[PDB]
Structure 1
Amino acid sequence: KINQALHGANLRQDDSVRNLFASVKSSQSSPIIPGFGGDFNLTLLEPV
């Protein structure tokens, strides 16, 4: 019983995390380009 309870808890917390993944997903966006921001050194934000 506690095993199916923790299985339920794990599945609903995964449910919550992809609800917030659906929340964070934009309808449209732009690919990140190196040298972004012009003179703005945002290279730590660069995902490469």
Structure 2
Amino acid sequence: QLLREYGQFCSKINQALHGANLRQDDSVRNLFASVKSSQSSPIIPGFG
């Protein structure tokens, strides 16, 4: 009952943590898209 009476501060904390987590997800997507190449050569046993 006491926590429900003032639960807004922790609810805001949950949103703030979620925003940082979303920022990490957006960063991972862009980084991997950059590493991916338009054309590639298939890897074969004895490559190089």
TM-score normalised over the length of structure 1: 0.69
Gaps of 5+ in 2: 1-11
How is 1:1-48 mapped onto 2 (pairs within 5 angstroms)? 1-37=12-48
Query: Between Structure 1 and Structure 2, which shows a larger proportion of helix residues?
Result: 2
Large movers: runs of 4+ above 6 Å: none
**Alpha-carbon deviations, 1:4-46, whole Å to 9, x = none?**
1111110111100110011101011111111111xxxxxxxxx
Q: What number of residue pairs does the alignment pair up?
A: 37
Gapped regions of structure 1 (runs ≥ 5): 38-48
Residue identity over aligned pairs, in percent, reads 100
- Tell me which of the two structures has the higher relative contact order, counting C-alpha pairs closer than 8 angstroms and 6 or more residues apart: 1
Q: How far apart, CA to CA, are the structure 1 residues paired with 2:32 and 2:19? A: 20
Q: Which has the larger radius of gyration?
A: 2
Normalised TM-score (structure 2): 0.69
Aligned-residue CA RMSD in angstroms?
0.8
